[PDB]
């Protein structure tokens, strides 16, 4: 009956500050793929919402004591009804929150500057000159932290070693990719987006694994099943494919 609290994060092209001469406020400040997805779910399901940015600007991971941060924490403490963001569905975070069915599929990969003909994530693990990392307290960071693959255990020992190999967000990871010999372990769909706009950047190698982005809710959320059915209906008619095309289309690279 009331307006849901939506926690989210600035992540292009998923959630961004709309451009305007006016000073914007409320939901009107935001636009992007996830905002379109939210508009569509709110229309189908008949709910309203208030979008709030998570104060610590993080997706969510556990520390050594087991406490969460990020949007995951927001759902745990019930300070948000939904998390609408490129939020990875992981069985680790299922210990604390719940997820709708995925609205987008992706995989971890490598964002690197075209110049060295490396082709594999293994090529990074067996050296030290090219520093590499991922977004701190994210699902890509946690995937290497908890992996049992001998190659990925090798890479996590690196990132655990260097202080600033773990970056605050994708923007600063991409910037570091352009200004240093650095490789960013980043998710497939973002790499597609960045490398279409930054012709100096390329995807290195295929996908490391497979995951899906879902809308997160508190455990036992009454809106969660309604969201899942709505998302599944949208994928049947390929409306989420159209929606990705709308926000990913652009210049292209020679
Ligand atoms: N999906 C991750 C966050 N996250 C994201 C991107 C990425 O490249 N790495 C990463 O960890 C680009 S969309 C968000 C999470 O939910 O923790
Ligand atoms: Cl509003
Ligand atoms: Cl806000
Ligand atoms: Cl679809
Ligand atoms: K403005
Ligand atoms: K309402």
- Say whether both 89 and 154 belong to one domain: no
Question: 3-state SS of the chain: helix, strand, coil percent to 5?
Answer: 35, 20, 45
Would you say the C-alpha torsion 49, 82, 37, 205 has a positive or negative sign?
A: positive
Q: How many CA atoms lie within 13 A of 173 on its CB side?
A: 26
- Say whether both 158 and 243 belong to one domain: no
Closest by Cα among 106, 113, 9 to 60: 9
> Cis omega before residue 219 (within 30°)?
no
How many angstroms does the Cα of residue 100 sit away from the middle of ligand 2?
Answer: 24
CATH number of domain containing 150? 3.40.190.10
Q: In whole angstroms, give the CA distance from residue 47 to residue 41.
A: 8
Domain that includes residue 45, residue range = 1-106+211-254
Q: What is the dihedral of CA 121, 177, 14, 220, to 10 degrees?
A: 50
**E strand map for the chain:** 4-8, 16-17, 30-31, 49-53, 82-83, 98-99, 104-106, 108-113, 131-133, 182-187, 201-204, 211-213, 216-217
Q: Which resolution, in Å, applies to this structure? A: 2.6
- Say whether both 134 and 201 belong to one domain: yes
- Say whether both 182 and 237 belong to one domain: no
How many angstroms does the Cα of residue 22 sit away from the middle of ligand 1?
Answer: 31
Would you say the C-alpha torsion 14, 20, 25, 26 has a positive or negative sign?
A: negative
**Which of 112, 139, 174 most suits a substitution to test ligand 1, by most atoms within 8 Å of the C-beta?**
139
Q: In whole angstroms, give the CA distance from residue 39 to residue 128.
A: 45
- Say whether both 101 and 218 belong to one domain: yes
- Say whether both 129 and 101 belong to one domain: no
Of all atoms in ligand 1, which is nearest to the CA of residue 184?
8
Of all atoms in ligand 1, which is nearest to the CA of residue 187?
8
- Say whether both 31 and 146 belong to one domain: no
Q: In whole angstroms, give the CA distance from residue 131 to residue 116.
A: 13
**Which of 138, 141, 211, 212 most suits a substitution to test ligand 1, by most atoms within 8 Å of the C-beta?**
138
- Say whether both 75 and 124 belong to one domain: no
Count of domains forming the chain: 2
SS3 154: helix
Per the annotation, does 93 bind a ligand? yes
Contact 187, 108 (CB under 8 A): yes
- Say whether both 93 and 141 belong to one domain: no
* Residue ID of nearest Cα to ligand 1 atom 16: 87
Question: In the sheet that 49-53 helps form, which strands lie side by side, from edge to edge?
Answer: 49-53, 4-8, 82-83, 216-217, 98-99
Per the annotation, does 86 bind a ligand? yes
* Residue ID of nearest Cα to ligand 1 atom 13: 86
Of all atoms in ligand 1, which is nearest to the CA of residue 90?
16
Query: What is the residue whose two structure tokens read 């604390």?
Result: 96
Pocket of ligand 1 (CB under 6 A): 11, 59, 86-88, 135, 138-140, 170, 186-187, 190
247: tokens are 């926000």
């Amino acid at each position: 009956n009331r307006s849901l609290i939506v926690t989210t994060l600035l992540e292009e092209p998923f959630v961004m500050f709309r451009k305007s001469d006016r000073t914007l406020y409320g939901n009107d400040r935001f636009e992007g793929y996830c905002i379109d997805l939210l508009k569509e779910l709110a229309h189908i399901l008949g709910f309203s919402y208030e979008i709030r940015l998570v104060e610590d600007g993080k997706y969510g991971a556990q520390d050594d004591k087991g406490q969460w941060n990020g949007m995951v924490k927001e759902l745990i403490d019930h300070k948000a009804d939904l998390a609408v963001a490129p939020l990875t569905i992981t069985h680790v975070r299922e210990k604390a929150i719940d997820f709708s069915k995925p609205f987008m599929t992706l995989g971890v990969s490598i964002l690197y500057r075209k110049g060295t003909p490396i082709d594999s994530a293994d090529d990074l693990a067996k050296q030290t000159k090219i520093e590499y990392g991922a977004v701190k307290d994210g699902a890509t960071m946690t995937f290497f932290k908890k992996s049992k693959i001998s190659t990925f255990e090798k890479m996590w020992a690196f990132m655990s070693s260097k202080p600033s190999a773990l970056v605050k967000n994708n923007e600063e990871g991409i910037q570091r990719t352009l200004t240093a010999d650095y490789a960013l372990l980043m998710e497939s769909t973002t790499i597609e987006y960045i490398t279409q706009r930054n012709c100096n950047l390329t995807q290195i190698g295929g996908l490391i694994d497979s995951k899906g982005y879902g809308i997160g809710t508190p455990m036992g959320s009454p809106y969660r099943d309604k969201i899942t059915i709505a998302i599944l209906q949208l994928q049947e008619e390929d409306k989420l494919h159209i929606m990705k095309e709308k926000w990913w289309r652009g210049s292209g690279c020679p």
